[PDB]
């Protein structure tokens, strides 16, 4: 027999490449390749392939690009350095409920005007979570990082993007119900672009993601190792209704030539606490399903207890919710309060000085939004950690563990079209 060379052979190997974005908003960018209105999906009969969501470099690219965009989009904005001044500040008491006592403060200070030789006396209402008592206050992070306000015209809506492989590469999708984080699956198809993934940023409860189709999925590395996070994907949504009931106004204060600070204004109507409403019966059925599935790894008669949270900072102990461009830190307690052998109202706090992906060295100021905010989201899954009885509680961590829940189905491979085989022919 003789060597015969074949070109265009259907052979692939694991690979890492950068991916293309396909699709004014802070992440949308509006510089992505328009998507294919009629994308193809090609089924591969008799192909079994191995996937591993915990070692998937698509997660790392999503993380790196979203952070880089955050800065590329918010970098060319007004700095708030002039606000790191001693503030004189007292409590807002004029028309408040009991739940809001001490929550808001009326601060006033001496700040630079359009002319550098003149000062103005201005005021703003700040949330308690943004100041430090030295009646004299400092803003949080004036001793740690520079604070830049976000540009008021930039939207923070989690508009979905698609990732696309370069020619010569392809993305394999694992179309397999009941497939956990790792191992082979018998159902694979080839796509050029991923499904659209919304860059939703949250902690503890995953919002507006994909649903499982047959059962609540519990995906984790090891399971028995309690140092790892458990990603729980619901097969049904739980609807959650969040609100910020106070009717706000805002002020534009010049801080020098070409720049202005967005200060909060006065509040219209009475002052009430922000909150989220989770349908109660829906939540109770949803956890019952989570429990039945958890028992498969812990024992059929094992008690599964749900606790509120571990101790920690707001980014750990409260639900992190970003809607309308406002930043909420919700109590998330009472949702996880059972042993398993109307609506739930979750009190929620608001904070304007944000330290997010870059934990230190940089801060962003969320400008106020006038009017009242009402936001409705889908709870699609949980981040849980584990401690006769097993105890579970809401967890958190870097965003990579949340984004990987939308990318567990994908792997990047390279095409190797050139190869040989023995045949009965010759040159």
């Amino acid at each position, epitope marked *: 027999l003789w060597v015969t060379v074949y070109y265009g052979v259907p052979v692939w190997k694991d690979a890492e490449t950068t991916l293309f974005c396909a699709s004014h908003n802070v992440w949308a960018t509006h510089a992505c390749v328009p998507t294919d209105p009629n994308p193809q999906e090609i089924h591969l*009969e008799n192909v079994t392939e191995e996937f591993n969501m915990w070692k998937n470099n698509m997660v790392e690219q999503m993380h790196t690009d979203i952070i880089s965009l955050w800065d590329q989009s918010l970098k060319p904005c007004v700095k708030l350095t002039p606000l790191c001044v001693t503030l004189q500040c007292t409590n807002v008491t004029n028309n408040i409920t009991d739940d809001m006592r001490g929550e808001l403060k009326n601060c006033s200070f001496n700040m630079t005007t359009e002319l550098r030789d003149k000062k103005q006396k201005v005021y703003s209402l700040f949330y308690r979570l943004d100041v430090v008592q030295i009646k004299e206050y400092r803003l949080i992070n004036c001793n740690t990082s520079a604070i830049t306000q976000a540009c008021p015209k930039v939207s923070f809506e989690p508009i979905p993007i698609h990732y696309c492989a370069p020619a010569g590469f392809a993305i394999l999708k694992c179309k397999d*119900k*009941k497939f956990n984080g790792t191992g082979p699956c*018998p159902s694979v198809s080839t796509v050029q672009c991923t499904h659209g993934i919304k860059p939703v940023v949250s902690t503890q409860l995953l919002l507006n993601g994909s649903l*499982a*189709e047959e059962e609540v999925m519990i995906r984790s590395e090891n399971i028995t190792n309690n140092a790892k996070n458990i990603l729980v994907q619901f*097969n049904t949504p739980v609807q959650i209704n969040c609100t910020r009931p106070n009717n706000n106004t805002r002020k534009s204060i010049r801080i020098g030539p070409g720049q202005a600070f967005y200060a909060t204004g006065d509040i219209i109507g009475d002052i009430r606490q922000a909150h989220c409403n989770v349908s109660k019966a829906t939540w109770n059925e949803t956890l019952g399903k989570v429990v039945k599935q958890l028992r498969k790894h812990f024992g059929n008669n094992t008690i599964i207890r749900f606790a509120n949270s571990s101790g920690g900072d707001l980014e750990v102990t409260t639900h992190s919710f970003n809607c309308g461009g406002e930043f909420f830190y919700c109590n998330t307690s009472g949702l996880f309060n059972s042993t398993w052998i109307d609506s739930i109202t979750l009190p929620c706090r608001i904070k304007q000085i944000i330290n997010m992906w870059q934990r230190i060295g940089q801060a962003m100021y969320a400008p106020p939004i006038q009017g009242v905010i009402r936001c409705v989201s889908n709870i699609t899954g949980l981040i849980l950690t584990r401690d006769t009885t097993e105890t579970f509680r809401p967890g958190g961590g870097d965003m990579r563990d949340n984004w990987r829940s939308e990318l567990y189905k994908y792997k990047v491979v390279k095409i190797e079209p050139l190869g040989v085989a023995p045949t009965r022919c010759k040159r």
Partner: antibody
Amino acid sequence: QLVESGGGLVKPGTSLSLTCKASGFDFSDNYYICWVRQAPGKGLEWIGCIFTQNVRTYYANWAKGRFTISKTSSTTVTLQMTSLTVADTATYFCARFSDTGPDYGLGNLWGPGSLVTV
Amino acid sequence: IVMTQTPASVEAAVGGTVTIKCQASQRIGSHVSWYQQKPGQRPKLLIYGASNLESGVPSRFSGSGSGTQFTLTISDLECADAATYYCQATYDPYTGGSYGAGFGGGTAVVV
């Protein structure tokens, strides 16, 4: 526990809704309920399935546009024929396929079935 | 959209053994269930997957298979244990679901 109804003799060209109920069970569990046909003298043929926690359905290719499946009450399901012909005379059964490992293959609860004659 | 069955009809003496065989047009792992249907009755499940019997099923029923080749062996045949046996693919390799998705058969086992 599954009991079929809505059968009987119907005229060619009409539509038909068959239903069944689970006596003693809520369907809000990890179940597939599937409809299976058997013409007299023939083997068993798959029509389609409904997943009950998240209503999603799957159909046999031959059944597309001819049959639809839906859930109604928490304890009942339905199979709707969009048109009937004489070739559709058969015994119809609903059955529950429970959860074992990686496979909802525990097709152990079958109703007695009902007959549809056209 | 997966299974086919080939033996059609088999006869055996009481106490004898028969086998039947099914094939899949697509690889389906071990996802094949088996049923026993007596005349005039709704079918009974015998086998969950290629290698697993349902509790209550006599030990004389056994089987194996993988990929596309699946079989059922019925030993120690009892008198008048006549039935039509069937195969079901419990895995749909196209949609990824794992539920009964295609059924077929016919064995006429008579004893």
